[PDB]
């Protein structure tokens, strides 16, 4: 049960980090008028 | 010619179009609407339901209505000159003649309006799809306000023209017919919710794929044979978002015609069914299983219990002519409550 918690925590932290740092990578520049 | 002159005059381009169809539509529409106002303002339902029903008595817009005739009247057309009221307008209102008045005049009114759609369509030179689409609502009115009571005991169990009254008709059909469990009604719900979905999503899509045809932020002013929005961009967007998108404007507009109209028709099938008490009330398998096995429970059985409650308690107040007497010991209920 603890290992499952570790797994899920790893996944959540992973995708959350990708989300946050992803949207910080100059997202307004990602448009067809650039 | 005489008829030709009549036609010429009736089909003149006025602020409000008339036509032959107008000959049928306007009187009946006027009388139905007016009867609703007249009833909801002055007429009571004390001698039919034992209920206050008008503004004069203290009802608000939500609780006021033109209630159904007394159960004893049966399926009487209840003419003002009928053998029940015998010309007496007061006794006519006390019996519930205003309900049959509103219902019949409303029906012929609907006929007249559909005929109006056909007539204007033919005069202008368009395809009569508006009228068909309107065959929808007609099916609802005919099945619910005419067929259902005609199948039942009397007009008494038809919906009363009013907000809270309609609410009563609803909870009645739930408690007595388990109307939510009926697949035809489910198709109806699919039709309506699907219709609203299509309306919203089409509106939003067109509004958000607009072409820049102006300099103002007010894109409304910037509006021809050229499309005002990008069909290709829309297609791309919904294809990458939802997996599937429209590609044919004609098919799109037909589709958002078809979904809601079909919904209405299906639910109408259902209602006819209920007119004969031919219900989708139970799942015999689960009833037998539950009868033999006191540990077996689904949301279906829970709702069956709910229906039983509804029926008892409201049965005593909703059908006063039956003289139902339920001692407080026979009323089904759970612990504490």
């Amino acid at each position: 049960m603890f290992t499952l918690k570790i797994f899920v925590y790893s996944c959540v932290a992973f995708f959350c980090s990708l989300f946050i740092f992803g949207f910080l990578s100059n997202d307004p520049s990602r448009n067809p008028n650039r | 010619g005489w008829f030709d002159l009549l036609d010429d005059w009736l089909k003149r381009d006025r602020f409000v179009f008339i036509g032959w169809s107008g000959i049928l539509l306007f009187p009946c529409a006027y009388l139905a609407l007016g009867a609703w106002f007249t009833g909801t303002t002055f007429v009571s339902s004390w001698y039919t339901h034992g209920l206050a029903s008008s503004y004069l008595e203290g009802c608000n817009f939500l609780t006021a209505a033109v209630s159904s005739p007394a159960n004893s009247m049966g399926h009487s057309l209840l003419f003002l000159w009928g053998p029940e009221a015998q010309g007496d307008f007061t006794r006519w209102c006390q019996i519930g003649g205003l309900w049959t008045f509103t219902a019949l005049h409303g029906s012929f009114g609907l006929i007249g309006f559909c005929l109006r759609q056909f007539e204007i369509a033919r005069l202008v030179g368009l395809r009569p799809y508006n009228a068909i689409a309107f065959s929808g609502p007609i099916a609802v009115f005919v099945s619910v306000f005419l067929l259902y009571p005609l199948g039942q005991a009397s007009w008494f169990f038809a919906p009363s023209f009013g907000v809270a009254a309609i609410f009563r008709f609803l909870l009645f059909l739930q408690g007595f017919h388990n109307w939510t469990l009926n697949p035809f009604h489910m198709m109806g719900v699919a039709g309506i919710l699907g219709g609203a979905l299509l309306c919203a999503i089409h509106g939003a899509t067109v509004e958000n794929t607009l072409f820049e045809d102006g300099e103002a932020s007010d894109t409304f002013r910037a509006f021809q044979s050229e499309e005002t929005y990008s069909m290709v961009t829309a297609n791309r967007f919904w294809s990458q978002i939802f997996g599937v998108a429209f590609a044919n404007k004609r098919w799109l507009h037909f589709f958002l015609l078809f979904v809601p109209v079909t919904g209405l028709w299906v639910s109408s099938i259902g209602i006819v069914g209920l007119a004969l008490n031919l219900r989708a009330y139970d799942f015999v398998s689960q009833e037998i299983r539950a009868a033999e096995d006191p540990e077996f429970e689904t949301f279906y059985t829970k709702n069956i219990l709910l229906n039983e409650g509804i029926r008892a308690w409201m049965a005593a107040q909703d059908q006063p002519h039956e003289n139902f007497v339920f001692p407080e010991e026979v009323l089904p209920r759970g612990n504490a409550l």
């Binding site: 100059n26 | 794929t209 607009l210 072409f211 820049e212 102006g214 932020s217 990008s230």
Partner: protein
């Protein structure tokens, strides 16, 4: 410009004409603040005017007076409203100030200059000027910190605040030793919002409240100074949209979140929102019913700790999933409740059965009766009770009004956030007015399949 031709916006979207007009915009803000303070004063005087001495606040439809009473004005031990004059004072002050802010608003809106960048340089700004914006932000942050310290000062030195957990029933108390321990405060911050946890809504003592405001005061002041004397880093400059509408959208998201949080505070918390003033919570009322009939039936000779209900669970007393002794029935869901009228009967392993058998006080029974009979349930036309109840009691708990209204507000404010954030992006990139017929992006893309 005040026309469609001169601005591009219509009379509805009329307010967008003020985006680049510093003067008239400032006028709009000041006038609006004037409206806020106006309402505060007028409504406070209304509540003071309609108030009746020997009735609880929550029976009289008061939402402003409970705040002042919570702060400790005109309150006797137990939550008795004796002096209703300081309320009148605050109301009057707010009203008159509303006259001042109103005058300033009308002036800067109609009389004064449209652009504050010409005649002035300190009150003028370009939306695209990051430094100026962070400066203003810093100033207002420092102001907020000062306000937090105003609450802290009021509670530490000037009379104190109404403590419902006070040893002797609810009474005004000067917070001698506030909580400055980061472990505790920030323990609130990093805690789950779910049952039994409650995040920051689960604060149950004024020490932690006031200490928290000390921390938030220091944080706001230090942050204000930080933003006044610095410029945004590269990553923030790359990540954000720098325009008025964007800032508006940010503040909108923030205020939506805050709206939801406030609704939850009003609905679950009974420390910052004393039940003596705001009325009981749903949880508190349900527990109060269970308590009430536990007492009634125990007085009728039933051993409640052994009383088996229809289900097989305890009729009056059972266990929570983690072992604690709790009240039975549906209120098993509300076993996380903490109320000053019940905690006397609380032990290490939950409710103390011995104290339940022997030490239940009359005032506790009165509390339970009052609260279960003033549960936050009622109709839109203020008919008290469950939906099936008849017309007799004119009552809707202040908690319901506050929570529902602020959910409404927070919700629509979130909608506004989506709207303005989206339009901010589209206006920044340059296609908020439609697709360029000569530069349609899709046409320059390879088809999907």
């Amino acid at each position: 410009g005040r026309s469609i031709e001169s601005t591009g916006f219509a009379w509805w979207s009329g307010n967008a004409r003020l985006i680049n007009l510093s003067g008239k915009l400032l006028g709009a803000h000041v006038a609006h603040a004037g409206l806020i303070v106006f309402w505060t004063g007028a409504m406070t005087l209304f509540e003071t005017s309609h108030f009746i001495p020997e009735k609880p606040l929550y029976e009289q439809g008061m939402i402003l007076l409970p705040h002042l009473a919570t702060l400790g004005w005109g309150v006797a031990p137990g939550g008795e409203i004796v002096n209703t004059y300081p309320y009148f004072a605050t109301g009057v002050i707010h009203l008159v100030s509303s006259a001042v802010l109103g005058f300033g608003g009308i002036y800067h809106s109609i009389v004064g200059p449209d652009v504050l960048e010409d005649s002035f340089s300190f009150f003028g700004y370009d939306w695209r000027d990051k430094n100026k914006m962070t400066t203003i932000l810093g100033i207002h942050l420092i102001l907020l910190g000062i306000g937090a310290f105003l609450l802290v000062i009021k509670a530490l030195f000037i009379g104190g605040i109404y403590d419902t957990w006070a040893p002797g029933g609810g009474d005004i108390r000067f917070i001698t030793n506030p909580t400055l321990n980061p472990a505790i405060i920030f323990s609130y911050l990093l805690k789950s919002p779910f049952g039994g946890e409650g995040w920051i809504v689960g604060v149950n003592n004024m020490e932690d409240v006031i200490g928290g405001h000390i921390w938030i005061g220091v944080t706001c002041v230090i942050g204000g100074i930080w933003h006044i004397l610095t410029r945004p880093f590269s990553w923030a400059r790359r990540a954000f949209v720098w325009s008025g509408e964007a800032y508006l959208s940010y503040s909108l998201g923030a205020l939506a979140l805050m709206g939801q949080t406030a609704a939850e505070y009003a609905w679950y918390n009974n420390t910052v929102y004393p039940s003596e003033f705001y009325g009981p919570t749903a949880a508190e009322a349900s527990q109060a019913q269970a308590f009430t009939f536990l007492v009634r039936d125990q007085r009728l000779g039933a051993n409640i700790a052994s009383t088996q209900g229809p289900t097989g669970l305890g009729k009056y007393l059972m266990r929570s999933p983690t072992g604690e002794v709790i009240l039975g029935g549906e209120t098993m869901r509300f076993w996380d409740l903490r109320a000053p009228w019940l905690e006397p009967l609380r032990s290490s392993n939950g409710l103390d059965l011995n104290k339940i058998k022997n030490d239940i006080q009359p005032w506790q029974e009165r509390r339970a009766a009052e609260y279960m009979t003033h549960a936050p349930l009622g109709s839109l036309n203020s008919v008290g009770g469950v939906a099936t109840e008849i017309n007799s009691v004119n009552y809707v708990s202040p908690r319901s009004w506050l929570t529902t209204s602020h959910f409404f507000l927070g919700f629509f404010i979130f909608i506004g956030h989506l709207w303005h954030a989206g339009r901010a992006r589209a206006a920044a990139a340059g296609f908020e007015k439609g697709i360029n017929r000569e530069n349609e992006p899709v046409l320059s893309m390879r088809p999907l399949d």
